[PDB]
């Protein structure tokens, strides 16, 4: 039965892949990094507190200037902050209050957001009549939008619960490229520093690297025991970290095509919600559900510092592009800047 | 350059006072999530009360109730978008004797969710008239699907409607206790389940959600002051 013959050749391929993976596993990252000195205790403190949201914040994204940032809360609002002076620059009401992601275009001209309406909405901040309003609205997903990030002022990538990611042409509103292959809900995506590729973490406990311009999945990494909730890129561009519900963080390399390190303690039994590296990639910040944020040493797997101060699950985080500070959004309806 | 600082300060002032009016509106709206299988009565309940969303007012108190429709079936992650809702309205078909275990398992998975640990559920045991039809016909008996029903005794606190066959009373109170046996098994008083017998033609199913949202707020305020 040709279905059983495809299942057999499938397993044959899975064992050729496991062998080609153990073939290049000549060492471990811990043996390599055992002679480095530990980063020491890193105790950042709340330098700013950005209040205003009436409900749980669910997504945030710094701007390129490392000064403004946007936060999306499920009270139906999308607030833009001037993080230096804690002033609000804009307060965009949303037609659907169940927003789940929000992005800030690298030109600072547009903001995007989407959620259970299955629609990615673009808002022009540099409007000419005065006020930011809707410009485009990207439809096509049969599932909820979990993450989205601009490439430029006309290309935007989305992640959805229909187990697909899509590259959009904001003007025509057409999905210029579709990325399919994930079995479970895609929860987070992160574009590489050179826009050329991007990764996605899905609820099938797998991460996938996608070629933006060609629309094919190049590599699929596994190892997590449950849903991947957050993902980033290492600042270099050849590695990325994932956090999943199994209370573990894992660092994958693109060129070696397998996991390098797992970040865990047997007293943490909670699901990681957001991940992000520092500017040099030495520090990996993760936002567990147990209201804390752990700052891990991305090279030694040692836990180094904690960011306590939230009264509910820390839902999101993000490091500035200059590396000057990190922001944390939580379900307590507050964002806190740390440095 | 201080002038742009004063312009930013008055932009912040206009923002905060718009956000204050928005805060009062958001503070007085009770969000309700409608959940339940298809081949049930959720959409009929929304049609009778009068999309994804519904907005209705009871006694000058507005509610906006939403049932999510265009998703897949793995609701394990968008469900956490409703951790702060006032109540979950769970609709079940009492007349579908074998997809009823699916409803019990979904209620159990919702009730023990780590992020809906404090969300009380209003249980609508819908389609009671068809259930009475099936019970009086005696062609598909509950014991073949739930053998506990053979030894089950109608509770002494039961209030049957005029003319109701004791077989129907035992059937609907058995489904009632099948869901209450789950809700009382692990609720540490943070939340409760409120069963109600409904049919597709019932018109008061808004006053019931009002009554029980009020009861949920009462019990939250009690358990807050350590009384209850």
């Amino acid at each position, epitope marked *: 039965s040709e279905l059983d013959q495809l299942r057999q050749e499938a397993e044959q391929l899975k064992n050729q892949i496991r062998d080609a993976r153990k073939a290049c596993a000549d060492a471990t990252l811990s043996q390599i990094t055992n002679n480095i000195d530990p980063v020491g205790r890193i105790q950042m403190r709340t330098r700013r507190t950005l209040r205003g949201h009436l409900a749980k914040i669910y997504a945030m994204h710094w701007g390129t200037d490392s000064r403004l940032l946007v936060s999306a809360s499920q009270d139906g609002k999308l607030i833009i902050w001037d993080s230096y002076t804690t002033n609000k620059v804009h307060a965009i009401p949303l037609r659907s209050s169940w927003v789940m992601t929000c992005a800030y275009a690298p030109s600072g001209n547009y903001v995007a957001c989407g959620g259970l309406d299955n629609i990615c909405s673009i808002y022009n901040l540099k409007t000419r009549e005065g006020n930011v309003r809707v410009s485009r609205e990207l439809a096509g997903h049969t599932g909820y939008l979990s993450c989205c990030r601009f490439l430029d002022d006309n290309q935007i990538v989305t992640s959805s619960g229909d187990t697909t990611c899509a590259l959009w042409d904001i003007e025509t509103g057409q999905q210029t490229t579709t990325f399919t292959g994930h079995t479970g809900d895609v929860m987070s995506l992160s574009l590489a520093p050179d826009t050329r590729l991007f990764v996605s973490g899905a609820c099938d406990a797998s991460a996938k690297l996608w070629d933006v311009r060609e629309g094919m999945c190049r590599q699929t990494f596994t190892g997590h*025991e449950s849903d991947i909730n957050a993902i980033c890129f290492f600042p270099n561009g050849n590695a990325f970290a994932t956090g999943s519900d199994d209370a573990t963080c894992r660092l994958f390399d693109l060129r070696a095509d397998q996991e390098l390190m797992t970040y865990s303690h047997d007293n943490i039994i909670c699901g990681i919600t957001s991940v992000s590296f520092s500017k040099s990639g030495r520090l990996l910040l993760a936002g567990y559900d147990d209201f804390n944020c752990n700052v891990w040493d991305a090279l030694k797997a040692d836990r180094a510092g904690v960011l306590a101060g939230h009264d509910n699950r820390v839902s999101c985080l993000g490091v500035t592009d200059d590396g000057m500070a990190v922001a944390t959004g939580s379900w307590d309806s507050f964002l806190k800047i740390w440095n | 350059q201080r002038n742009e600082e004063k312009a930013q300060r008055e932009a912040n002032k206009k923002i905060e006072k718009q956000l204050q009016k928005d805060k009062q509106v958001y503070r007085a709206t009770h969000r309700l999530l409608l959940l339940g299988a298809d081949n049930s009565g959720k959409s009929t309940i929304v049609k009778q009360m009068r999309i994804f969303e519904t907005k209705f007012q009871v006694d000058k108190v507005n509610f906006h109730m939403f049932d999510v429709g265009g998703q897949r*079936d793995e609701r394990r992650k968008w469900i956490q978008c409703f951790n702060d809702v006032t109540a979950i309205i769970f609709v079940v078909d009492s007349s579908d004797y074998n997809r009823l275990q699916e409803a019990l398992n979904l209620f159990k998975s919702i009730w023990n969710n780590r992020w809906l640990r404090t969300i009380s559920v209003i249980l609508f045991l819908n389609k009671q008239d068809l259930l009475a039809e099936k019970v009086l016909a005696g062609k598909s008996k509950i014991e073949d699907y739930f053998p506990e029903f053979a030894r089950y005794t109608t509770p002494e606190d039961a209030t049957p409607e005029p003319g109701e066959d004791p077989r129907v009373t035992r059937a609907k109170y058995f489904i009632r206790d099948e869901f209450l046996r789950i809700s009382t098994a692990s609720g540490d008083g943070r939340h409760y389940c409120y069963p109600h017998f409904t049919c597709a033609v019932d018109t008061e199913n808004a006053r019931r959600i009002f009554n029980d949202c009020r009861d949920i707020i009462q019990r939250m305020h009690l358990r807050q002051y350590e009384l209850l």
Partner: nanobody
Amino acid sequence: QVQLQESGGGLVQPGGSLRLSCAASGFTFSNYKMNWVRQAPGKGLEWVSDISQSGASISYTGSVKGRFTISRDNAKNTLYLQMNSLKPEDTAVYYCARCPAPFTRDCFDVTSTTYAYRGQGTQVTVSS
């Protein structure tokens, strides 16, 4: 990579017996609540029985209550659905599902088409 291999299950006359062995590889077996989801031909997925983190609390669908048992062995990393007195309607594929989160009591794993942490199936057939 989480993968679940079921074994056992073949043509068995009514009132017969079988034992379905679900071996799990790729995670920590003890943390996860396990279920048996069977699919009869022409109908959606159906949930049979679940066993808790350590075999502490087990629970059954009504139709298989008093007939089948469900045992978990963390040593060999597996669980077994021992079926006895099989009826002509217990003929179905038997996926061995895992709940999607450790250290918790909820799961949503009877899904319509695609759930990522259940196996492939051992078609158990029962007829005369």
